[PDB]
Ligand binder design. Sequence first.
Ligand code: ROG
Ligand code: ROG
Ligand code: ROG
Ligand code: ROG
Ligand code: CL
Ligand code: CL
Ligand code: CL
Ligand code: CL
Ligand code: CL
Ligand code: CL
Ligand code: CL
Ligand code: CL
Ligand code: CL
Ligand code: CL
Ligand code: CL
Ligand code: CL
Ligand code: NA
Ligand code: NA
Ligand code: NA
Ligand code: NA
Ligand code: NA
Ligand code: NA
Ligand code: NA
Ligand code: NA
Lengths: 396, 396, 396, 396
Amino acid sequence: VTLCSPTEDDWPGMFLLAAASFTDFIGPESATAWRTLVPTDGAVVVRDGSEVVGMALYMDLRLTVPGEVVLPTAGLSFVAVAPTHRRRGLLRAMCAELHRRIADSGYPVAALHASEGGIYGRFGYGPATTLHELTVDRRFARFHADAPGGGLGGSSVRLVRPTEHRGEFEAIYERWRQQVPGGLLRPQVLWDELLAEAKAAPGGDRESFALLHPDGYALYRVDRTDLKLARVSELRAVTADAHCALWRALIGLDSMERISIITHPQDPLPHLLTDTRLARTTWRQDGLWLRIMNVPAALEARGYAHEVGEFSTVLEVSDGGRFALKIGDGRARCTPTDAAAEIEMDRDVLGSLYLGAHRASTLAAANRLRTKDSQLLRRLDAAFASDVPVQTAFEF
Amino acid sequence: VTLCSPTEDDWPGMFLLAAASFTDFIGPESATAWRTLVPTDGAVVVRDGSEVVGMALYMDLRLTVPGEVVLPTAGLSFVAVAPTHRRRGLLRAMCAELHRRIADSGYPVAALHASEGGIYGRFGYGPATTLHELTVDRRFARFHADAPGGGLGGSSVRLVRPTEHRGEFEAIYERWRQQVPGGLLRPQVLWDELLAEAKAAPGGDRESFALLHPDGYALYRVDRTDLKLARVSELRAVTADAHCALWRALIGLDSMERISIITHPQDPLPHLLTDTRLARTTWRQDGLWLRIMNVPAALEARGYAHEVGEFSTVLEVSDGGRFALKIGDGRARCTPTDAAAEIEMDRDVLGSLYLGAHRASTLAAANRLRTKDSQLLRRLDAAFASDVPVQTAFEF
Amino acid sequence: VTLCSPTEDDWPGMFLLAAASFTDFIGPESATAWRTLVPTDGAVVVRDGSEVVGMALYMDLRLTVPGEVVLPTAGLSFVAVAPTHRRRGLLRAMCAELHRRIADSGYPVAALHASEGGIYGRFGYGPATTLHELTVDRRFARFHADAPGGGLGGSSVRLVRPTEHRGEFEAIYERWRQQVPGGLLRPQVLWDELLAEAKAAPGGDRESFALLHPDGYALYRVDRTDLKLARVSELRAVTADAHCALWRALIGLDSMERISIITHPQDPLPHLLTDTRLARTTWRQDGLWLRIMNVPAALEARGYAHEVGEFSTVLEVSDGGRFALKIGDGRARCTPTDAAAEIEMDRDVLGSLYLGAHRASTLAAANRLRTKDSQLLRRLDAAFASDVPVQTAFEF
Amino acid sequence: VTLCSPTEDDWPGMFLLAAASFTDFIGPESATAWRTLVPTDGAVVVRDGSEVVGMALYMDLRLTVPGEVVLPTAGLSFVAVAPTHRRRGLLRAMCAELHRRIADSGYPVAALHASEGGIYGRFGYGPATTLHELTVDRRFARFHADAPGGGLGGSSVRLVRPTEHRGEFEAIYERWRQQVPGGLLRPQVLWDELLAEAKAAPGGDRESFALLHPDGYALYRVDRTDLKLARVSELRAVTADAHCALWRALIGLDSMERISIITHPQDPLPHLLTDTRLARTTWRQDGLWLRIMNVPAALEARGYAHEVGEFSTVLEVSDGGRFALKIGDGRARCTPTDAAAEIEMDRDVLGSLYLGAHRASTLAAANRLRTKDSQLLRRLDAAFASDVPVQTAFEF
Ligand SMILES: CN1CCC[C@H](CSc2nc(N)c3c4c(sc3n2)CCCC4)C1
Ligand SMILES: CN1CCC[C@H](CSc2nc(N)c3c4c(sc3n2)CCCC4)C1
Ligand SMILES: CN1CCC[C@H](CSc2nc(N)c3c4c(sc3n2)CCCC4)C1
Ligand SMILES: CN1CCC[C@H](CSc2nc(N)c3c4c(sc3n2)CCCC4)C1
Ligand SMILES: [Cl-]
Ligand SMILES: [Cl-]
Ligand SMILES: [Cl-]
Ligand SMILES: [Cl-]
Ligand SMILES: [Cl-]
Ligand SMILES: [Cl-]
Ligand SMILES: [Cl-]
Ligand SMILES: [Cl-]
Ligand SMILES: [Cl-]
Ligand SMILES: [Cl-]
Ligand SMILES: [Cl-]
Ligand SMILES: [Cl-]
Ligand code: NA
Ligand code: NA
Ligand code: NA
Ligand code: NA
Ligand code: NA
Ligand code: NA
Ligand code: NA
Ligand code: NA
């Protein structure tokens, strides 16, 4: 049992562990596309002593944070321990080695999507975005008098085949990901994968259709088994007009009873209808998780709310440094100090605060965040809050 | 078909319409207790066409709003139109008469709980609190190292019979309702009703138990049919210590698989556990609805966030006045003006903003709230935000 | 094992067998009310091995048949064989003795409701009415422009407590039962039972309400467990106006999702709506079963369609006689003959034809009814058809 | 937005709208077969803006009506409005243009299958056949002593592969469709489609088998998911012997618990068993809808019951003409008049009466059909009644 960067000969063993570990594993030809996002020395394997019994890697990603700032991000992925080798500390050893490499490579943050909620807190990852499933009973749905795009003249939305309008989807997504906290650059290979996944599979998913607006798109398909349910796989809108117009078209799917979408807690959709209750929250879960690799680099890189006045404090991250934190005019300066801490938190808590999805006050009430000053708590809440609601780009 | 204040002789007819309209109607002896909260001229009936075919009333309530300010509130209730008299405008006529009386009596706000989400927007009511059902699979639940009250020594929480500790529940609730936006004064007659509802009914609900802390209580009962589900009917905690201690006791119900509670979106419970995902959001719905009766009185009465700097704007409420709104040092001044509006919204939208449960930005994105200045939007968001999370007291 | 008319001392043993045999058995005090409808020598018991191991009886009923003719009817009821004494021919021996007594007493017909569909055919009983469950999704229900009672002015329907309007229900039912094939006289004791069953039971059924029109009523209650389902236990309307007005009131139960009723296949309700499909048939089953005791007496007693011209044929009932049947001007003459049969059928088939619920052609296609003349088949179809649709009065 | 006959270049756009509108859309190569039934100028499209946002067409069909008369029928089909273009009156404009063309082409009737029950009434279509799902628990099913084909000697029914006996199915169907009201000519291309749909699809439907009698056939397959359910897709029998023999074979599927079939309300199957209740009605819905294009042509073309004596009346169809209607010796004469109307009905009601599936009395009780003479109602009921039960051929 030793820990190594895999050679080309290790990858068949890694795909076998992948197929046994991940139910949503497409296969090796699809795995080739994703592999292009793994940098040299981005992967570790554990061999027994010989077959692959553990693996983990990161992908080179670009993450948008508040203030429309784009950070180089290490996307932790393809993490698996063989069922034959549980409770040997293989995950701890693989995560320690990858974090060393990620830190040394100069990534200010790492990110992942968690298969379970109890694993990644102890490695410094905090849940940073919230997935919100809305199910609309579209048979009762009437748009409010106030909702945009409810007048005479033609529709701005077109029903199209996804594959024939790739360029338009790419361009709209690129605009979206740059202006929204949680946005990820989507490289060409992941557009290849998305559009291949949009065709009908024999005994699998039904054909996907697209609703296309100049400033937004929705990809949807009828559910495999519930033929009265339309599942929106992806809706990206750059303007309120685009968002409302796309939902007018979706509510116009007269053969469906229900439209479902995985969106974010601040989706304005319920407020577009005369009955806000028709847009039902059916499911809620942690989305992207963040580990702040470099506390001062991360805190200085993002923008803060201009509304809160200039303030100074001392932040201690448990086994992650103590800093003089000065926040004013929407910017932070974060410098080493040995002055007494006014705020303490584990590294995972800072990750959860970083994109504005969780309030310092809420984490303080659970004692995940310690201070004796409630004024400082209000100030942190307001400063770290995101003006543009935090959203989730795509799973990896 | 005429509209009148009911006489004592009308009430049997009103209880018949009540029994046919409300599945949760206990009966006349329980209705006597609630009736003590209805002021003289608090009720309207429509006679045919002669029997009661329509009724509506308000109760005298006290509602806590941000800044720990307590407002006299008209609680709209017992609203019903006979199934024989639908689509005759009876609801519109009853609501118009009660709103006249509520306004003339000097109530700054009216409030209600909506049986459907599509009815009350057009009468100026906006959803102002959010109900959030959490279901905890307590078999997997482990408290985080950071969570309070996880050391040696005795437990501060006692398992007690509700009826023998009425005084302690009342005193804890009174502290709670005064410091939390959405808090309602609970009069003696509603404590009588709550504790009568806590005993086992033959062929009905199981016996209720209480977990009692000096600074909090939880009332719970095992579900009628799912004998592995404990339903928390009410948990009120004045400190984080009390909240955590009560949840340690609830997770200690070793014969249950699941604990369910109707709480609020900022409940810190998920952050008390090593796996935040174990506290699942199973249900989400509008709680209390507010109609702002007097815009300047309501806006001047509540506290605003001290963090946002002094700012001035002009707010138009659709058919509800135009005001010069100046917000600074956590207070608002709201005076008549004919100056050009910078913000427009229907009266229901203001109700939805008033306790801090909805962001101006979110309502703006649905065009329920119109402005050409995005800086003003950020300022409204921050100013109307509530430092203490908004919660829902009790249904009426 | 001997077969006897029960003495007063046998009835406790009969109530024990009743409680073990019938899940819907209320108890002895309710059984006293029903017993008043059992004539002297109306009951047989089998003693062992001495306790009651078998019982059967008939009640004196009045059944309306086509032409508004009311026949004395023996209502077979309370039929049970102990689980300890199956397959000893106890049912055959009890039915043979009761049929002897019913025939000798001068009843032209016997009737029953079958606990199973496979038992009573061999004793000469044929299913004669069809139960049809309609479930209306009332949220989508809009009345057609053509539907009666959709104008200005007051409602003719009142929401009332059943017990306070007994006289009106009785009078409407009496009019209904006299003009509808399948109608049964409902004696005072069964009105006592119906109205006692209309009150809420602790851990049982919810309170019943009534919708009252001068020419119709509906009794309904919210379902025990599905609180969005209203169950109409009984709707009796003497005019189309009354039927439509009552359904307008039922569709006005705005707190319900669904209204269910057990009605008949020709219920006009689907045709009152713009979408006939909203009135869904969820359940269909045989209602009343008839045994024709005296073929000539039964055939001469009912009215026939005036539209079909005079015709003569020879009908053989298997081990029930051969008759010259002459049908003209809506009357039949049925006299003994030894002339060759043109129509043959078992006695159960004649029961199924008698109230017009089944077509001779349909039974002929199953070979339950034999003839070599298809013209005679068309003539029988038309003659036995009922102008007023056959309905089911109440179970016994 | 203009309305045109599509060119060959429009059809890819029509197949895209088809795939997005119809979940049961096979694809373009199958669509080629159906297209052969669309006459020149049989199709309209709406272009925006230019893509297809609306389409509708009719197919040239042959419909059997009472008296074994075969009418040229316009089969309305492929009707779809893009979800982006709802509530622009596109359906009304397309239906108006197609009805103009259908009327001018000399079709006496149009027909369709309705995706929803609330759409087509306002365009003059009435539901004219009733689909009846029977589910038989075949484990309890015993054939009555009277049922045909229950003796010694060989079986007349063979278990065969559908594709190897196409000629026999075609010949039996051709006999069936000519003698049954609701029968449709099935062209070669739809036999091609039916038999391609009878083979097993990877991840789809299981292999179909056929039971073949000289005078009938049943096509059945085991359900995708419920492996104890056999679904009869089609049973056509020309004689009672064939119908019973096929059901003896179906009840002989000893590895199944349940047999389901979509049949008609007069299916004699329940009467073939000792327990009629085993043949359960699980589902009921409108089948074929008719619009009478030419009232006198349609009314004169069908046969009427010979049993009812000659009678004369005046029928007004709302905005469809007033006619002197004389019915005698199974024929109608229908001539223009300005004499006072004795019967009034919308055009959709006449469609519902035309094949005998609905009684004039039932529609009169809903006030869809107005007269002051109840004798005339009885006469219409009897005259329009169908001697051979109305059935549904195949969906389009
Ligand atoms: C499991 N996980 C759950 C959430 C969804 C997610 C989408 S599919 C996917 N995702 C990947 N990150 C990869 C990688 C492959 S192959 C593949 N496939 C080889 C080397 C690089 C990583 C799949
Ligand atoms: C329906 N509604 C749903 C939500 C829960 C709620 C609790 S029970 C209740 N509530 C009332 N407001 C009243 C009143 C009665 S009696 C009663 N009962 C007579 C006069 C005053 C109003 C019940
Ligand atoms: C079972 N059977 C199913 C269908 C419904 C039906 C209604 S309840 C009922 N019905 C009766 N016929 C009786 C009799 C009693 S007691 C009673 N109870 C004693 C002597 C006379 C007969 C009950
Ligand atoms: C939707 N609808 C529901 C009920 C069943 C029905 C059977 S499949 C079908 N049916 C058609 N009428 C057609 C047509 C095509 S393709 C096709 N396919 C192109 C031009 C002519 C019309 C399908
Ligand atoms: Cl990005
Ligand atoms: Cl580990
Ligand atoms: Cl809106
Ligand atoms: Cl308060
Ligand atoms: Cl109203
Ligand atoms: Cl914690
Ligand atoms: Cl009677
Ligand atoms: Cl027996
Ligand atoms: Cl109608
Ligand atoms: Cl035909
Ligand atoms: Cl339209
Ligand atoms: Cl038979
Ligand atoms: Na965050
Ligand atoms: Na999200
Ligand atoms: Na609020
Ligand atoms: Na709440
Ligand atoms: Na009958
Ligand atoms: Na019936
Ligand atoms: Na018909
Ligand atoms: Na049919």
